[PDB]
Every structure is written in structure tokens, then in C-alpha cells.
Amino acid sequence: PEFQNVFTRVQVKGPVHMGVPLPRGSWARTGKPFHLYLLGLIGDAQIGPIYLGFSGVASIIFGFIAIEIIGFNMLASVDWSVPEFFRQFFWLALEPPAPKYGLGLAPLAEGGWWGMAGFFLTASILLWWVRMYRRARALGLGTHTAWAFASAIFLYLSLGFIRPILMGCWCEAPPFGIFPHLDWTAAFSLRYGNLFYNPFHMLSIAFLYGSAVLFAMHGGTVLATTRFGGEREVEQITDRGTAGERAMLFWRWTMGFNATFESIHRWGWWFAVLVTLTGGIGILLTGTVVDNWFLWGVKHGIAAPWPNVFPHVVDPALLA
Amino acid sequence: MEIGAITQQIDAAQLVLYTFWLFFAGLIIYLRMEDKREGYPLVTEIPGKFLEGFPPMPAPKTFILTHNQGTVTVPRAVPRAEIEYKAEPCAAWPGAPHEPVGPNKMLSGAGPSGYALRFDTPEPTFDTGVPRMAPMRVATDHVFDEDGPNPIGYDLVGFDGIVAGKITDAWVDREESLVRYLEAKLTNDKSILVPMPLSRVKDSTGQVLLASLKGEQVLEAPTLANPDQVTLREEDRIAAYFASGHLYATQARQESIL
Amino acid sequence: MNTGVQAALAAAAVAAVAVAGVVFGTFERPPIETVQRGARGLAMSELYNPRFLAETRAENVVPASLPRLPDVGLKAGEVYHNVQVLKDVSVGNFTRLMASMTTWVAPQQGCGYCHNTNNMASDAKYTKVVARRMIQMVQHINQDWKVHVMANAPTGVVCYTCHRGNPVPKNIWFNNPGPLQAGGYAEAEIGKNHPAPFANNSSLPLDPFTPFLEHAENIRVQATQALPGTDNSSIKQTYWTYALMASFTQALGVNCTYCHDSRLWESWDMAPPQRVTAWYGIRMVRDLNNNFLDPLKTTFPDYRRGPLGDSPKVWCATCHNGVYKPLFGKSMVTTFPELTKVS
Amino acid sequence: AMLSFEPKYRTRGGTLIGGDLFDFWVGPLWVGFFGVTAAFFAILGTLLIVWAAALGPTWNIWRINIAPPDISYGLAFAPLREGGLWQLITVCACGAFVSWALRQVEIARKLGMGLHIPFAFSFAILAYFTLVVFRPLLMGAWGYGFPYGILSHLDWVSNTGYQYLHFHYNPAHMIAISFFFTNALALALHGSLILSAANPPKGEVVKGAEQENGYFRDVIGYSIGTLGIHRLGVFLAVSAAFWSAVCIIISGPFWTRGWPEWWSWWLNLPMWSH
Amino acid sequence: MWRMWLLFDPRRILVALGVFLFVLALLIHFILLSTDRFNWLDGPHRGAVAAQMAPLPA
Amino acid sequence: MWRMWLLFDPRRILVALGVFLFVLALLIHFILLSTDRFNWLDGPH
Amino acid sequence: MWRMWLLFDPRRILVALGVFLFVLALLIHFILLSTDRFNWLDGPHRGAVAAQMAPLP
Amino acid sequence: MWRMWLLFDPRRILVALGVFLFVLALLIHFILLSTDRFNWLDGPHRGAVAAQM
Ligand code: BCL
Ligand code: BCL
Ligand SMILES: CC[C@H]1c2cc3[nH]c4c(c3C)C(=O)[C@H](C(=O)OC)c4c3nc(cc4[nH]c(cc(n2)[C@@H]1C)c(C(C)=O)c4C)[C@@H](C)[C@@H]3CCC(=O)OC/C=C(/C)CCC[C@H](C)CCC[C@H](C)CCCC(C)C
Ligand SMILES: COC(C)(C)C/C=C/C(C)=C/C=C/C(C)=C/C=C/C(C)=C/C=C\C=C(C)\C=C\C=C(C)\C=C\C=C(/C)C(=O)CCC(C)(C)OC
Ligand SMILES: [Fe+3]
């Protein structure tokens, strides 16, 4: 068959690309880049250099302290037993504060460490957002990456900061652990009545599925047209070639309409962004303006009428 | 205790949902308008009837290009000229296909052999106006990596097993440091370029396999205007010629196989 | 071949073998038996592995019981010296019950597990003192809690229901705060974020029995109306409710849909009648632990108690032992009327 | 109507079945043999859905619920009013999806493109086939398929998930979610980078591979490149669907207990087993 | 051992050493805070904890 | 030690040191606020 | 059998052997530590719990 | 045996040895803290253990 362009075995070693000159006052790029044949198989072979400005170093320091708070408490929760740490690592977490303390500062053993880790991690994420914004400007690029990142931060802040404030308790926020934060996700749905019936949860899923649909379609489109230089997308945007025309005609002949090599990336940008934008809004609504999503769904005529195959039963707590 | 109720039936979450629907309707309108910056207005089977569909075409936007190769405004007020493709319609009614003409359908400009009239100048690098694609005899700072195949000196073979020539040099992308074309010296002394995405480097037998063209059809592939650089338009011509072989190399490849 | 490629292939080869080891060492296989219990397409049904079910049926085989002797003649209350609960039983049936209790509780140790072999009336051994309280517990269950143990059929319970031929039943529980952690300012052991055997080895709370099956903390967390204003239950509380409901599945060998429709957990209009029976099971367990097992704290020796010194307690799996009904609903108390009435 | 550049591309050929008989366009859509077949299955399947809705108790679009047969029917074809209609709609859906994929193959061949797009779509079809035929076949009853209804099939997902009492602990479920979440992160990054390069601040020149690769080397120390990101987009999206199919095929045919219990193999490893 | 600094970069060693020593010191201070006996702030008497399984404060 | 600024960028040292000191100071203030004895706002319980 | 080093590069063999021997020894030491009989620090594992229950609401 | 530093880079060996020994020493110190008997900070008898027969 034809070359499927799955991976690249024929590779050439050129001079390392350090990037465009930076604006006056910027730091020097860190590290000496080197060629790696393994990464050249599936993508670009060069590793480095990296730019570490003020935002990058500040974000790392803030984030590292937060990670240390999580890890030290996780290790203390198994009484410093390394065999138990490896055994239980997925089960461990840094738990959010007890409901007693509301929005106030909890004692260290009862959620105080969680709040400090939440603050330092949030600062690190925000400082990383500045890094994504400023690195784009330094290269003369648009800030689309930073604003897409802000959408992801919105869901993160809604889960851990905005909604706990709206509910009046840091106890509603997720824990810092792998299995426990899955427990929190499930317990959230149990408490607030089947989050499937949250319409913004429906939309977020539609865009999450849609992001997988679009990237499979778009990635497949580019791979199918790499024989025409389809992966050189910006050059296709400013001077349309046969790769762009065939890509547009494939989808027009398939489903009756098509994008362009520029607008497809707008479809992809919004579909990913709307996952966390609609998701964040849905999380802010539950417990604040809706307490049971299934009963809200029943009220708004979206609960399918499933037959009841059992004899009628009365709540035994009422007759007691 | 009814927190979030606006009326007896309308609540806050419902209102926020309808607010999103209005935004999403506007977003789809915006996205569909952006989709219409290329290829619109549509052409019909009427000399001067054009359709823009719904939503209408957006206001023009301008791209500034590097190294004084001009400004591009999309949607174009006057669309780019099309190539003079040679095909005969299979029927007169709208929606019917056409059949490419000529003994070599890969040169007809119809079907998969068509291409766009791109810039007739090489794509330049950003740092310097130097052509982006260059043969490794010119781009001496690029060398083949070890523990990977070296196609120089391999035979160029069509899918029918006929050897069309030998690989003499490779063309690299000076921006991404990768191979994009293999240059082959054909048996008629032609020195054509073959697309790397359409080449299977079999380092076991020392052959570069072409699944798209027979050996004799390789001999009619496009040649460069000058041997050390390739324009954007020439890149489209080369890609169209080789890729159209999957449908035009043999009569079997164009017909239903079952 | 490039060294980085070799390392990547070796790492991929190791992972594939490791995945193969986990997959072939843990997974089950078809055929699987399905018992549909809800409406078509609502995915309310029970799964049963036939190989697991065959093993389960083998260990729930009811032992044959001695035939019941006539109740005419001398009564054990008059004949024997220290008989406080089995007074109305005839001598022949009293001896039959003692033989039955021996096989049900301590078949290996015989009559000497509870009795001084030369003085049967003596209560020197703590086991006899517990046994007398256990008889009262069985009589209490069969008479006053037939809303649960005789919900559909006159099943009832006997000593074998929990003990299964062992002095210590397989399924008991103690007050468990969780494993020891670091002290000082480190995050406290809250009974969560550790592997919880009672909660299917998840990170859900590891002791849901203390607040619910000994104390009477509210299990319900869901609001009964669409909009807020009536419910202040926290996600923290939902953890313990989730953990207790996980223990129900293990205890009965069923899943959530056996008692619930997942689209509304709080709904009783959408629930099978098994949820009503389970509701009384909670109150029965609290009665057993608060009134029978806990007051026996001083009678139990210290090695029979928990790390906190509390007496061993009953929960759902003590009787059910992984089956939707104990011994698949087979009744053993029908030929033991003395175990169905409170003295 | 056709795009400005379209007319030269409308060649005859590329079909797998039929040939010139169905090789024509209706408006912007190419038909071919599988377009006829896809149209037939799609229209019949949709019409049967409406008829099944007509037999139901509501016309509310959100509340229409077409359910599979009872488990007791096994692998037999049930009567139409008791899950037989669901089975017919399922067969139409399977035919429509396969025809759509095969139609895409012919369209890609007509344009001389690779077959990457239908290849990627085939994994979506595999997940659907896992849900409605493969998993029900291993369980021995068509009643295991999800009901056809906008909100009613969420009820099937919810109840199915709680048949294992904590579906987050399903290991293939974790992998599939990791692929879905990473794909959305990758899509947001890729869409942003292209738009940022093609749409710099007003009056500034458009940016190319030097800034695109330079951007992620500056922020993260590595750039996968334009070819790599489109490979990654397919790989992440395809593997999300593949591991989704795995996560549900093992739920019930190969695992009948709570998913958290499955992790006891890790807890009981002899290096740290209690 | 002066000859070792011709083999190891003083920039690399000092930066790696500073990070390593701070993390180690931070870890040891945390471990002491995670003991009752060596807790220097509140002392040896650990405070009582609040109920985790509690409703929202309303 | 005046030569330590010959091999270390003073701009880079000050930025790293400045962030480190502020993060450490935030860490210590946060710890004290979460203690019973050294909470200076609501005081001891 | 000295010829084994004419076939394999010594640098890789020693590094591979050193990594292999440490991981195996770490594996064996940990397996014994998890047992009651061969635990050389405390012996049988008692599974200590926290001193008190977290109070109910 | 001195003919090993020409075969192995001393810089790579010392850095690898330094990381390995520190991680190993952390591992052992951590394990002793987890034990009841060898905990040198809080000492023995830190939790509750059920009596055995
Ligand atoms: C039983 C569980 C419930 C359920 C409970 C919830 C809850 C609760 C939530 C969701 C949410 C979502 N659910 Mg749900 N959900 C259910 C069933 C489903 C099903 C299904 C087929 O059954 C699907 C496909 C989904 C899918 C989804 C997504 C659409 C959405 C998550 C978006 C996202 O990508 O967040 C992932 C992305 C983020 C969380 C942002 C991350 C960005 C930050 C910046 C990360 C920084 C990392 C940092 C630098 C590193 C730190 C490392 C340190 C060591 C800590 N759910 C069932 C009904 N679901 C979320 C939502 O938005 O709902 C409206 C949400 O909160
Ligand atoms: C439990 C009973 C005792 C106790 C029992 C023991 C026993 C038994 C031993 C120790 C040993 C040590 N104990 Mg003690 N120890 C206790 C409690 C403590 C406490 C505490 C807070 O309570 C501390 C801080 C320590 C600290 C120490 C260290 C001084 C020492 C481990 C050396 C090491 O890790 O080298 C690791 C670091 C190196 C080897 C440096 C490597 C140099 C390289 C080769 C050169 C190049 C460097 C390279 C460029 C940079 C990378 C290296 C970096 C360090 C990462 N112990 C309790 C009180 N302890 C060990 C010891 O004394 O060793 C001499 C030992 O045998
Ligand atoms: C549109 C929504 C989707 C999305 C988008 C998105 N995410 C993004 C972005 C975008 C557009 C970015 O630009 C940003 C990024 O940088 O991407 C490369 C990012 C990002 N999304 C990430 C994760 C992420 N995204 C997720 C989800 C999503 N992201 C959505 C699906 C998730 C999920 C599903 O949970 C995760 C986990 C990160 C990879 C990145 C943000 C990175 C960040 O915030 O970095 C700072 C955080 C830290 C914890 C600091 C780390 C510190 C180091 C570990 C220290 C190492 C040691 C140290 C050097 C020692 C010395 C220290 C001294 C103090 C001693
Ligand atoms: C040598 O060191 C090592 C040993 C290597 C360290 C090892 C560390 C390790 C292994 C760490 C592992 C960590 C792991 C596995 C973490 C996993 C975390 C997961 C999955 C988290 C998931 C979700 C978490 C979320 C959403 C949390 C959000 C929290 C937020 C937003 C909190 C914000 C509040 C802010 C901004 C405040 O201002 C409040 C602060 C204050 C008022 C003081 O307190 C109230
Ligand atoms: Fe792209």
C-alpha cells in the first residue's frame, strides 16, 4: 500500500534551531538543544531550548511548594511507610477542610494544609497563564493559547475556589489525590441528583465528544493530504494549495459543507474551550440554584417515562 | 424555600441555559461565515450566477506576508484563475462527472491531477529570504541521521516493478529539518523530484517504491524550472502528478473493483 | 537499531507482558448469568458468574437437622438447675437444641466449648454466658424483626445463619478509626483515603458501620425538590453514605440496582421492594449491636474485642455472607419453635 | 452549486461498487453506491424511530424512549412492539455507519487522498458495535444494548455504571478518559497555535514554523511539530474510542463485581501485601 | 580535592545543592511538625478534630 | 565571595531569591494562622 | 568464555547487571519485610489504628 | 579495577551514585520511622492495637 505517514524513519540532522531573536531585555534561552531519533519518529527530534522568564520561575517555585505539601501529607498519612506509600499511592489524598470551619482557615490537621496547597497551586497556575500569554507576545503571535488556557482555569477555579465560596464551605472542594478525587466526582453526582441531568453537563459532554470528533477528522484530513503538503497549514491559509482544496472538497462531498484550513482551527479551538466553559458554568449552578438535577429535569420535561415493573412501595420512614 | 426561582416555572439555571443557546447560535453563525473565506461565492451552471449561501460571506481580512511577497485579502474579490484542465463531461445535466483526456491522464489537470496556481516563487525562510526547500548538496548543514535509512543511490521503482531511475539527492525543509523530496535521475536524464510522503524507502533492497505510478509514467513527471529551488506552484504540480496515479495509473484503478 | 528505540520497544514489551499478566490473572469470562429485574433498557439487572455462583452455592448448603421430638413430658425448666431462657422446652427437644447448637457454633470443640463437662449448670466459661445472650438475640430476631427476616418467606435465623459452624462468624466489624498516621500537624486520620475492604477496596470511608449500623446518623443526602433551600447535606456526608451502600453490595452479592434506580437514589416510587426490606435491616442491626453485642463488651475476652476495646458487632454480611438471602432463603428455624419466641 | 476551484476536481471514478451508475453529485454531496445505501438506511432507520415514538406515550423529543427487548428473549428477534423495532433500528444504524465509512473511502480515492479519515471513523463504529452487538452477544441477549432516546440512554449509562458500583475504578475507563481529556487539551493547543500564527496582532506579519515550533520550545522545552500534532490528534482520539470500547466490553462479560475490587491485585502484591 | 571542580561545573553543583538542601530541610521540619513530641508550635497535646461527616454550616 | 556574581547572573539570582523568600514567608504566615496558639486574628479556642 | 566480552559491550553489560541486581535485591528485601516471619524490624504486622475515632457530628 | 574510570564517565557515575545513595538513605530512614520499635522521634506505642490471645 501507500506510505501512511505513521512515523518517520528517514531523518536528517540540521543545525539546532534556537528560535527567533527575543525582544530587548529578555533573558537568554536555557539549555543546549540536542537531536533525538526516537522523538523524530513521531514528531520533531529536537529537545530544547527553553525560556525561563520571571513567570516561569515564579510558577515553578509556587507549584513545587504545593506539590511538596501534597506529597508530605500523603507520606505522613501512611506514617512515612514507603512500602505502604507505594501500595496505597492511588488511594492517598490531601483532604479538604472539615465542614465545621466554613470559609475560615482550618487547623493544619483538619484542612489547613489543603488550603495552603490550593493557594500555592492556584498561584502557580495563574503565573503559568502569564507565561503562556507573554511568550506568545514575545514571538509576535496572538494570545489564543492563553485565552484557551483561561477556559481550563475557569473550570479548575469553579471546582475548587468559586463554588466553595458560593456554598460557604471549603469542604465542598475536591481533594488532592487520584482515587479520592474520583470519589469526590461520584459523590458530587450522588449528592446533587444525577449530574447527567445538568444541561451544562450535557453540553460539556457534547463538546468533549465533539473535540474527539473534530481532532480525529482534522488530524485524519491533514494526514490524508500530507502528500500535498497539507501539514504546512499556515502557508495553506495565506496561499491556498491543492491540499486545502482537496480537504475542503472531501468534506463538502461527504456532508454538504466544509471549513477552511484556518476556520477548522477555529472550530477546534471553540469546541475544546466550550468543554470547560460550559462545564464551569454547570458546576457553579449545582447546589447554588439547583439542588437536585433529576427533579429539575422532571420539572422541565426531560425525564423519560420509564415503566415501573415493581409493586408500589411506600417510604417506611413516613409510617414509623 | 425555592432558591433560584424566577417564576413558578422558570428558574435561574433555565435562563442561563437559554443565554448559552443564543451565544451558541451566534458562534455557529460566526464559524460558518469564517468557513466561507475560500471558494465562495459558489459557481453554478450559469455564466454569471453566484450563490453565497447562508450565512453570507464575511468582510475581507488581510494577511501580511514575509519578505515582500505581498498582501493576501480573503475572501478574494476576484478569485484566482484556475488551471486549464482537459476533461470531457460524462453527461450534460448538473452533478455529472467528467472524464480526463489525453494518453497521460496525470497531465490532464482534471480530477486528482488538478492543482492550484500558487505563488510562482519559492517559499522563503522567516529569518532570511533563502528558499525554504533546498537540495542537500546546497543545504550542506543537513546530513542524514544514522540508525535510519539513507536513500541516496537507491533505485526508484514503480508499482509494476520497472526501475525508472536512481535517487541522487534529497531536498530538506530548512525550517523543520526534515526530508520533503527525493531527487531522482531518470533513465532519460530528467532529474525529477518525488514527494517523500508518496515514497516507501525499502532499505533492505535499496529501493524507493512508488505505489502511485508505473515505471514508465515516472519518466513524464514535472521538472523544476531551475535545479536548486522549487516554487510553491511547482510543489503543487509534482504532488498532483504523483497522487493522481492512484486513480489514473491504470484503467483498473479508476473503475469499481467489485 | 537506535538505543532510544530499543529502550522504547523494551519498555513497551515489558508493559505488554505486565498487562497480559494482570488481564489473564484477574479477569472473568463468559458465559455470565443475567437476572433482569427492571424495565427493558433501564439496565437494572443482576450479574452472576456461574463459576463463582457454583462455589457460593456449595458453601451455603443447609446441614440436615435432627428430627423434632414430641413436646409432651418433663420441661427443662423443672428438670435442670440453671436454665433461664429455655424453660418451656421439653427435655428431648432441649437436648436436640444443644446438639444443634454444637454443630452450628463449635462442631470441632463439642459440648466443652461452652460447658464444664462435669458440671453442665456451671457458667464459668464466658462462651456459655454469650451463648445464653445469643439465644435471646435469636428469639428476639425471629419474633420482633420478622418484617426483615420473614419479609417474603418464613425464613428466620438460627445460630448457623451467622456462625456457619465457627465460633467466630466470618463477617464481623469493630470501631475502626483507620490506620495509624503521623501525629502533630499532619492531616488527621479521618477514616478515608485508604483502601477500604468494607467499601470494595476503594478510597471511600473505611468505617461506614459506626455512624449508621451502631449510631443512627442520617443516611439520606439528596434533596427532595429541584431547587435549593431544604437540604444542607455535604459531599463529605455523601462519602459515608456511598461507603455504606458499597458494603450492602458486598454483603448481599448484588449491585446498586437491586434496591435503587440510579436516576434518583432517594426515590421510593421507583424502587424495588427489596429497598424496604433493607431499610428495616438497618434498624434491626442497630438493635442487635446496641442492645445485645455492645452490652457483652465485658464478657468478651480482650482478644475477642477490637483495637479500641469495643465488642465485635453484626452487619449485613454476618447473616447474608454474600447472598441476597442467607443460605439462599432456606429456612432452618421451622423445626426449632423455641428459637422463635421470646421467653 | 460548486466552489470556485471545484469544477476541475469532479472526475469520474474512485468507486468500489456500482461504477458510473451512482457516480454523480446532488448539490454539494456525492452519492455513489454507498451514498444510496447510507441514505436508505438513514431514512428507514429515522422513520422507524418516529414510528416507535408514535407507539410510545409522548412526542416530547427529550422523552422519546425506544428500548431493546427483554433479557429473556436472548439473541432472538423480538416482536416489534417489545424491542423488535429497536433491533431493526440497530441494524439500520450499523448499515448506515458502515456505508458512510465506505462512502468516505470512495470520496478520498476520487480526490487522490489517503484513507486516514475513514480509518479514524472506523474506531467510532467499533465502539458502537461494541455497545449494541459485541457486548450483548457476549452476554447472550440483545437486551443489553442501550435504549434509543436522547435522555433515556443517559439512564442506561447511569444504571450500567452503578451495576459495578463505582465505574471510575474501571482501569480501561481511566485510560479512555485520559485520552479524551488529553485530546481536548491537544485540540485547544493546536487550534490556538495555528490561529495565533495566522492571526497575529493587527499590522504584524503572519508567523510560520519558526514561531510555531519556537513557541512550545519556549514554554515547555519541546515542540512536536506540525506533522506530529496531527498524528497525535488522530492517535489520541482513536485511542479514546478504542479504550472506551475496551472499558465497556470488559464490564459484564469479563468482570461481574465492583470495579474498585479489581485493584486488589495491586494491593496484594507480595512486595507490600498485608 | 580542588581538582574535582575542573570536572564538575560549579554552577550546576551549587544550584543542585541549594535545591536539595532546602527540600531536605523543609522535609525534616515537616516531619518534626508531624510529631506530638517535637511539635514546637502547639506542643505535645494534639488538639481534638472536628467531625468530617458533618453537614454544611447553615 | 564577590566572585559568585561572575558565574551567576545577578538578575536571575534576585528573581529566584525574591520569589523564594515571599513564598517561604507566605508559607510560615499560613502555618501560624492554622495553629491554635499562634493564630493572631481569632485567637486561641 | 572470556570471548563473551568480544561480543557484548562491557559498559552496557555492567550497567544492565548493576540495575538488575539492585532491583532484584530490593524486590527480595521488600517481600521478606512484608511477611510476619522474616520481618527483621518489628516482626508480625499488628496493623495499628489511630488512637481515637473522629467524633460524630 | 582502576581501569574503570576510563570506561565509565566519573561525572555520570558520581552523580548517579549520589542520587542513588540519598534515595536509599531516605528509604531506610522513612521505613524506621514507620515502625513502632525503631521510631526515634515519637517512640513506641503510637496507636491502638488489639490484644492477642
Ligand atoms: C458519577 C460521576 C458523574 C459525573 C460527575 C462530574 C463532575 C463533578 C464533573 C463532571 C465534569 C464533566 N463530565 Mg461528568 N459525570 C458523569 C458522567 C460523565 C460521562 C459518561 C459517559 O458517563 C462523560 C463523558 C462525562 C464527562 C464530563 C466532562 C464533559 C466534564 C469534564 C470536563 C473536563 O475535561 O475536565 C477536566 C479539566 C479540568 C478539571 C481543568 C484542569 C485545568 C487545570 C489548570 C489543571 C492544572 C494541573 C496542574 C498544573 C497540575 C497539578 C498536579 C499536582 C500534583 C496536583 N461525565 C457522571 C454522571 N462530571 C466536570 C464538569 O465540568 O461538569 C459540568 C465536573 O466538575
Ligand atoms: C534511626 C537511628 C538514627 C539514625 C541511624 C542511621 C544509620 C545506621 C546511618 C545513618 C546515616 C545518616 N543519617 Mg541517620 N539516623 C537517625 C536520624 C537522622 C536524621 C533525623 C532528622 O533524625 C537525619 C537528618 C539523619 C541523617 C543521616 C545522614 C548524615 C546519614 C546518611 C548519609 C547519606 O544519606 O548520604 C547520601 C549522600 C551522599 C552519599 C553524597 C554523594 C556524594 C557524591 C558521590 C559526590 C558527587 C555529588 C553529586 C555531584 C551530587 C548528587 C548527590 C546529592 C547529595 C543528591 N539521620 C536516627 C536518629 N543514620 C548513615 C551514615 O552515617 O552514612 C555515613 C548510616 O549508615
Ligand atoms: C480547553 C480545556 C482543556 C485544556 C486546555 C489547556 N490546558 C493547558 C493549556 C490549555 C489551552 C495551556 O496553555 C497550558 C499549557 O502550558 O499547556 C502546554 C495547559 C496546561 N494544562 C495542564 C494540565 C491539564 N489540563 C487538563 C485539561 C484541559 N486543558 C482541558 C481538557 C487537565 C485535566 C483533564 O485534568 C490537566 C491535568 C498542564 C500540563 C498545563 C498547565 C501547567 C501549569 O500550570 O504549570 C504550573 C503548575 C505547576 C504545578 C508547577 C510545576 C512545578 C514543577 C513540577 C517543579 C519541578 C521541580 C523544581 C524545578 C525544583 C526546584 C524548585 C525550588 C522551589 C526548590
Ligand atoms: C521530594 O518530593 C517528592 C517526594 C518528590 C514529592 C512527591 C509529591 C507527590 C507524589 C504528589 C502527588 C500528588 C497528587 C497525586 C495529586 C493529585 C491531585 C488531583 C488529582 C487533583 C484534582 C483536583 C483538584 C482540585 C480541582 C483542587 C482545587 C483547589 C483550589 C482551586 C483551591 C484554591 C484556593 C485558593 C486560591 C485560596 O487562596 C484559599 C487558601 C486558604 C484561604 C488559605 O485556604 C482555604
Ligand atoms: Fe491543523
In a domain, D148, yes or no: yes
Q: State whether residue C309 sits within 8 Å of chain G by CB.
A: no
In 3-state terms, chain H is what percent helix, strand and coil (to 5)? 45, 0, 50
Which chain A residues are closer than 8 Å to F11 by Cβ?
27
D270 domain-assigned: no
- Check residue H43 and give left, alpha or beta (phi > 0: left; psi -120 to 50: alpha): left
Give the number of beta-carbon pairs within 8 Å between A and D.
326
Verify that D53 and D124 share a domain, yes or no.
yes
Chain A touched by F19 (CB under 8 Å): yes
In ligand 4, the atom with minimum distance to the C-alpha of A103 is 45
Q: Give the experimental resolution in Å.
A: 2.2
Pairing label, strands B207-209, B155-157: parallel
- Residue B142 has its nearest CB partner, among A12, A44, A245, at A12
Q: Name the grid cell of F2.
A: 564577590
Q: For the packed helices B12-35 and A263-285, what is the interaxial angle rounded to 10 degrees?
A: 180
Query: How many angstroms separate the CA atoms of C102 and C105, rounded?
Result: 5
The helix/strand/coil state of A177 is strand
Residues D92 and D180 placed together within one structural domain of the fold: no
Cα–ligand 3 centroid distance for G30 (angstroms): 35
DSSP secondary structure, D126-150, as one string: HHHHIIIIIHHHHHT-GGGSPPB-T
Question: How many Å lie between the centroid of ligand 5 and the Cα of residue B39?
Answer: 19
Interchain CB contact of H49 with G (< 8 Å): yes
E32 Cβ under 8 Å from any chain A Cβ: no
Residue D274 forms part of a structural domain = no
Ligand 1, residue A155: give the atom nearest the CA. 40
Q: Which three cell numbers stand for residue D242?
A: 478504542
The angle, 0 to 180 degrees and rounded to 10, between the axes of the packed helices D225-249 and A199-224 is 130
E54: closest chain G residue by CA:
G57
- Ligand 1 probe mutation, A89, A201, A285, A292, most atoms within 8 A of CB: A201
Please tell me whether residues D152 and D32 are part of one structural domain: yes
Q: For residue C249, give every residue at least 6 positions away whose Cβ sits within 8 Å of its Cβ, in sequence order, or none.
A: C200, C255, C256, C258, D165, D258
Domain count, chain D: 2
Residue D203 belongs to a domain: yes
Query: Method of determination?
Result: cryo-EM
Instruction: Say whether both D8 and D143 belong to one domain.
Output: yes
Q: Strand, helix or coil at A103?
A: coil
Nearest Cα neighbor of C59 from C339, C330, C311 is C330
D159 and D183 inside one domain: no
- A144–D193 CB contact, under 8 Å: yes
Residues in binding site of A for Fe(3+):
218, 233, 265
- Type and span of the H or E element at A13: strand A12-13
Last residue of a domain, one of D163, D179, D214: D163
Q: Residue D15's domain spans which residues?
A: 1-163
In terms of domains, do D84 and D177 share one? Answer: no
DSSP A93: E
Ligand 2 atom closest to the CA of E32, numbered from 1: 21
Q: How far is CA D36 from the centre of its chain?
A: 22
Residues D146 and D181 in one domain: no
Distance between CA atoms of B79 and B67, rounded to whole angstroms? 24
HEC per residue, chain B: CCCCECCCCCEHHHHHHHHHHHHHHHHHHHHHHHHCCCCCCEECCCCCCEECCCCCCCCCEEEECCCCCCEEEECCCCCCCCCCCCEEECCCCCCCCEEECCCCHHHCCCHHHCCCCCCCCECECCCCCCECEEECCCCCCCEECCCCCCCCCCEEECCCCCEEEEEEEEEEECCCCEEEEEEEEECCCCCEEEEHHHCEEECCCCEEECCCCCHHHHCCCCCCCECCECEHHHHHHHHHHHHCHHHHCCHHHHCCCC
Q: Does the beta-carbon distance from A99 to E49 stay under 8 Å? A: no
Residue at D170 is within a domain = yes
Pairing of strands B98-100, B87-89: antiparallel
> In 3-state terms, what secondary structure has residue A110?
helix
Sign of CA dihedral D130, D133, D134, D140: positive
Instruction: Give the neighbours of chain B: at least 3 Cβ pairs within 8 Å.
Output: A, C, D
User: Is position D38 within any domain?
Assistant: yes
Task: Look up residue A10 and give its DSSP letter.
Answer: -
Of D60, D120, D204, the CB nearest to A301: D60
Using CB atoms, which residue from E33, E46, E56 is nearest to C232? E56
Q: What is the β-pairing status of strands B163-173 and B133-135? A: antiparallel
Grid cell for residue B167 = 535517487
Query: Which positions in chain G touch A83 (Cβ < 8 Å)?
Result: 30, 33-34
Measured between alpha carbons, how far apart are the two ends of chain D, in Å?
Answer: 73
Domain boundary among D163, D181, D201: D163
Do residue D125 and residue D188 come from a single domain?
no
Ligand 1, atom nearest to A209 Cα: 24
Residue D249 lies in a domain: yes
Ligand nearest to the CA of A267: 5
Is residue D86 helix, strand or coil? helix
Residue D273 lies in a domain: no
- Please give the Cα distance from C112 to C127 (Å, whole number): 10
C-alpha cell at A140: 509576535
> Could you tell me if D104 and D126 lie in one domain?
yes
For residue B51, which phi and psi values (nearest 5 degrees)?
A: -115, 130
Specify whether D180 is located in the same domain as D258: yes
Task: Tell me: do D112 and D225 sit in the same domain.
Answer: no
CA-CA distance, A215 to D229, in Å (whole number)?
Answer: 10
For ligand 1, say whether the CB of A185 is within 6 Å of any of its atoms.
yes
User: Looking at this protein, which amino acid is placed at residue C209?
Assistant: F
Is the CB of residue C257 less than 8 Å from the CB of residue C38? yes
Cα of H17 to ligand 2 centre, how many Å? 13
Chains in contact with D via at least 3 Cβ–Cβ pairs below 8 Å: A, B, C, G
Determine whether the interchain pair D270/G31 forms a contact, defined as Cβ–Cβ distance below 8 Å.
Answer: yes
Cβ contacts below 8 Å, chain E against chain H, sum to: 15
Q: From atom 42 of ligand 2, which residue's Cα is the shortest distance away?
A: H18
Contact between chain C and chain E (3 or more Cβ pairs less than 8 Å apart): yes
Most E CBs within 10 Å: which of A57, A60, A72, as the mutation test of the E interface? A72
- Specify the 3-state DSSP secondary structure of F4: helix
CA C138 to chain centre: 15
If asked whether residues D135 and D237 sit together in one domain, one would say no
For A202, D129, D228, D233, E54, the CA distances from D183, given in Å and listed in that order, are: 19, 23, 13, 6, 38
Q: Last residue of some domain: D120, D141, D163?
A: D163
